[PDB]
Amino acid sequence: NHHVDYVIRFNYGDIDTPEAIKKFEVLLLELSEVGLQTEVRQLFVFVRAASKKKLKRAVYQSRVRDWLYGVRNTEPEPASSAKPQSEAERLLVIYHLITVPKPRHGEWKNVDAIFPLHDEETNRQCMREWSKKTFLSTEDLDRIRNTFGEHVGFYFAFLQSYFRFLMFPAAFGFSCWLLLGSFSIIYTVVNCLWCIVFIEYWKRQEEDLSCRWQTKGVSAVHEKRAEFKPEKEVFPATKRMYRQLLQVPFALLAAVALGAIIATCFAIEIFISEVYLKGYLVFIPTILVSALIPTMSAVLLTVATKLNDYENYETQDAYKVALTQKIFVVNFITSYLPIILTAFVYVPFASRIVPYLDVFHSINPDRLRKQVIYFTVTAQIVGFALETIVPFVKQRVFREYKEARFLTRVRNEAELEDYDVTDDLREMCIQFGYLALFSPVWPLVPVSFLINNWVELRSDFFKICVECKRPWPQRADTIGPWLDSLGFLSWVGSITSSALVYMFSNGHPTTIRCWALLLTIFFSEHLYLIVRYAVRSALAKLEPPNTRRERIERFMMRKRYLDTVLFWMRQRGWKESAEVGLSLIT
Amino acid sequence: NHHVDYVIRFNYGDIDTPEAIKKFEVLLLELSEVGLQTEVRQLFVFVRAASKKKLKRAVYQSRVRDWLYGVRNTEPEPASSAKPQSEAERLLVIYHLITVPKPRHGEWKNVDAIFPLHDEETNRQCMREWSKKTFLSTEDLDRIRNTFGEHVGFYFAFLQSYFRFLMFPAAFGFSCWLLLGSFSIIYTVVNCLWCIVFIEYWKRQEEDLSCRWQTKGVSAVHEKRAEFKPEKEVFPATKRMYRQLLQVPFALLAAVALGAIIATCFAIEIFISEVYLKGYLVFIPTILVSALIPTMSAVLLTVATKLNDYENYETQDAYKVALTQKIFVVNFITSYLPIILTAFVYVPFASRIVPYLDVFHSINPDRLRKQVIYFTVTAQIVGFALETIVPFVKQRVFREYKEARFLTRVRNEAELEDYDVTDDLREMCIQFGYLALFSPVWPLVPVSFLINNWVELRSDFFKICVECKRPWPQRADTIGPWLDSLGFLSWVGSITSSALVYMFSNGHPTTIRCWALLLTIFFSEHLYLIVRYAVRSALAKLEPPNTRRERIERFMMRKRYLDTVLFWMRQRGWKESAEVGLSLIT
Ligand SMILES: [Ca+2]
Ligand SMILES: [Ca+2]
Ligand SMILES: [Ca+2]
Ligand SMILES: [Ca+2]
Questions:
Q1: Contacts of B237 in chain A (CB under 8 A)
Q2: Which residues does the annotation say bind Ca(2+) 1 (chains A, B) (predicted)?
């Protein structure tokens, strides 16, 4: 409430003369458009829309272009009475007012970046209300729509829909851990059948909440594209397929590196499990894995980054897509292959090739029980520490080294990080996987996410408020690539959790491959397919109310543009038909 | 060219008084709407739109309702200058003018049905031109759009796209039958990879040809629905899921009957293959299969018909859908299970249980080679006879028993059958299957459809012209359920044609199940999946021109409805920014 929208910082990295040039040339553009760019020399500059007669103009100017691309799909209210209907929506148009051509933030200019600010009065409110309820409401959800954009709004709406459906397995796995032993064939059915229903609910659910927030985002921006065929009314999109061809050996190259290194670190802990500072030597492969694969994957980001900027790349969203998918092959290997080696080569066999060893440098049954505890329970607790508490003490301590209340405030706003939805969402999609792939080992697992996600929903909202910078409102119509990638994940969980039940069916080469390890895959996994065919088509028929209301609303709109703009036959019709009709008597 | 659109026949099945009532009560409705219902007592009646000032009204009245449901998606030309732009389109509106409520054809009235007529001048033209070309053109395709409706138009456009892509396997299988033996692992790859590309081309192709013909059909009619909740602005659609639940044991009941009977008939021919009028006894299981399963399946139509009319069933198209899918489970069993028993139980084993027999009533290698010849080549030739030649001699001979040139013509028009696209399309989707499932046996198969489909395209067009009645123009936006069912078919072909290569890998219990029959399924069939994931997403990115032009055209239309209807900050903007901007020196 201080008449300010964005800050725009600078460099101090060059000589004084073109910095004097490059400061006012970007100021003159904002002179041309926005106005009242007030600056206070750190340099940064405050930016606010100058006149309401311009502000009411451009919001209408957005809501026109938002309409006639087929997104708003209503009649836009005319330019006289255009209320902004939100706060972040008002702060959205300013960002498209600045960032557009005809002002590149991260490149080509001296600016680091552009950030909006928080509302510390209502943010200290928003915690303490729904820190009390069981799980929060739509009237609280829309507060995270009217602020924080709409891409963040899916993230809580994904999480809330993921929260109130974990109450069904965590109740059920509570029973089989109490009634049965582990590995009950009743449990793995209720595991896998649940995972189909959650996705196909959420695929139906995104159609509502994007309709309810008036968004089908199909037009964001172009950048850096270099336009190898110029037209002003563009590039052969086949050459994407020629260069997405090159995307394939990346995954094997990430497989051959990180698959080797983790298994190399997996090889050593079995060696010390057999060939016994000895206890200090136990920590060594955990030390070796904890220092290489954060670095070695950080190499592989730079490769995929160097891959992803090959193409012209006309959009803005698909870079966030294409970088996510190429990062996702790393996250799949480095967070599941620790379990798969214990499950698939360590306990069935490998006893066989335990005498292959490093001299130059007996099956433990609880390797599985211990390590799945280490991933699904304990790693969230230290993940609760490394995400939240570590940057908070870094925010407070490093504050202490280095009308004027804003410049105390705004400079400490510049200290923080930007928020990424995707980097916080990838810890959710991975932690979905331990439920999908290794719930039959120790079936108290969905409790451990249920207790997590009630806290993680409150913590990640707290993480956005004070421990990182204000995200500018980006709009979206789905959760990105994560929806398509999530169904692939539970597909694999149909294979493994089927096989994992049989190999531990009271015991265990020892068990038959011919009769039971492959039929129990082929029967089960092809039963996972057809139930997914059943429910995906079933919930499509039950249409939800908003997308019916949207389809009604485009019908009623086209009613307006209609209405606002706008040789012998001798029967003489009717009477002589009575005479020929009377000829039915014969 | 005789000023006539439809004929409407009658019953002569009741007493004379309500027939006098029921004739004029349906005449009075047409008196209210159409006019000039001229009748000639067989009784039937000719129907033509009376005044052009009504005809130009109702075509505009269609093109309004066709527009504001979001199908036409253009501006409708106003009611003054509405040219019908076709012939069948003019004859389409008349059918919706008659059939609608506020005149049931097959029920509730004395009428058998309603039929339009042919144009024997141009139909004798249309054959002799494209009986000459290699394969016909879009200017000839649109002639089958401007007549015969648009649902028939997909059928040739499906067939033509299926014709000019058979030239690639029939060239390739010509090589491996000449170069290799059968069962070459190179051939089964080029078989299966082709089957992915054809579907995902045609899934992309329907988006063009429906756009090019201005059709996204989502509003046809309601009928017979009984409306168990009445509202005038309806039924809990969940009770469909309660009654599509009951649709599941139908398929097993069709499986347990016809799977037994065909295998029972399959059991007997092996008995005579081992236990030797003896040659007249050979024909007996072929006689037993040729008389029971046409009758036994004809029972199962009546069951699925009695199933399909359980629900309220609000649409018109989905009955043609839901009857097709429930008939399709019969067609899958009764036309592939003859081969699968020879392939999967006869040659791998069963030598084992050949001494189980009917006393009370040695492996032949060429059972497979003979029977696949009997299905993919010879059955088309007798299928060429039973479809075309048998009703034609039934048309001419039974004509000879039982200004007045029309009543010679029109009465012989009433002799014929209605045309079904679906009943003629199901012989195509099945004969796709022999290519998909059993092409590695005798790889000259895709030649035998290539030679077929050049003839079958010409014959089925001839079948519609003279040997069955004129189909009224029905509109559609796809080929119905057959597209979704076709991808399921080639899915199964990934399983069988993989396994069929290994079991015949130069020889053959004998071959290992453990090491090679199940890994060669699991490796291959899950490689069929991901290539289908590759191409389906690849051809989506390469957008075709018409659906880009459609998206442009809805953009430019919404341009018209837009345009036709329509506190300390003290820098003083720009100048004093030069002084504070000069403070970069420090
Ligand atoms: Ca966390
Ligand atoms: Ca978190
Ligand atoms: Ca035929
Ligand atoms: Ca035919």
A1: 541-542
A2: 387, 424, 427, 456, 460
What burial class does residue A384 get, using C-beta atoms within 10 Å of its C-beta: 0-12 exposed, 13-18 middle, 19+ buried? Answer: middle
Report resolution in angstroms: 4.1
SS3 content of chain B, % helix, strand, coil (to 5): 65, 0, 35
By C-alpha distance, which of A455, A430, A435, A456 is closest to A446?
A: A435
Specify the residue for token string 């080029």: B190
Tell me how close the Cα of B12 comes to any Cα of chain A, in angstroms: 8
Other beta carbons within 10 angstroms of residue A8's beta carbon come to 24
d(C-alpha A227, C-alpha B130), whole Å: 45
Locate the domains of chain B by residue range. Answer: 1-586
Cβ pair A94, A49 in contact under 8 A:
yes
Residues 6+ apart with CB under 8 A from A51: A35
What distances in angstroms separate CA A394 from CA A291, A388, A415, B91, one per listed residue? 22, 10, 10, 78
Instruction: Report how far residue A526's alpha carbon sits from residue A513's, in angstroms, rounded to the nearest whole number.
Output: 18
User: B26 with B39: CB under 8 angstroms?
Assistant: no
β-sheet with B44-47: strand ranges across: B38-40, B44-47, B6-8, B114-115
Q: Crossing angle for the helix pair A185-212 and A482-503, nearest 10 degrees? A: 170
Q: Which amino acid is located at B283 in the chain?
A: F
Separation between Cα atoms, residue B74 and residue B72, nearest integer Å: 6
In order, the DSSP letters of A175-190 are HHHHSS-SS-HHHHHH
Query: What b-and-e string marks burial along B424-436, b requiring 16 or more CB atoms within 10 Å of the CB?
Result: bbbbbbbbbbbbb
Q: Are strands B44-47 and A114-115 parallel, antiparallel or unpaired?
A: unpaired
**Using CB atoms, which residue from B564, B569, B583 is nearest to A41?**
B583
Q: Residues 301-320, chain B: which have Cβ within 8 Å of A?
A: none
The experimental technique behind this entry is cryo-EM
**Whether A353 contacts chain B with CB within 8 A:** no
What is the Cα–Cα distance from B47 to B62, expressed in whole angstroms? 19
Is residue B33 within 8 Å of B97, Cβ to Cβ? Answer: yes
Q: Which residue of A has its CA nearest to B35?
A: A573
Which residues have a Cβ under 8 Å from the Cβ of A338 and sit 6 or more positions away?
A262, A266, A371, A375
DSSP annotation of B78 reads: P
Q: Which residue of B has its CA nearest to A79?
A: B566
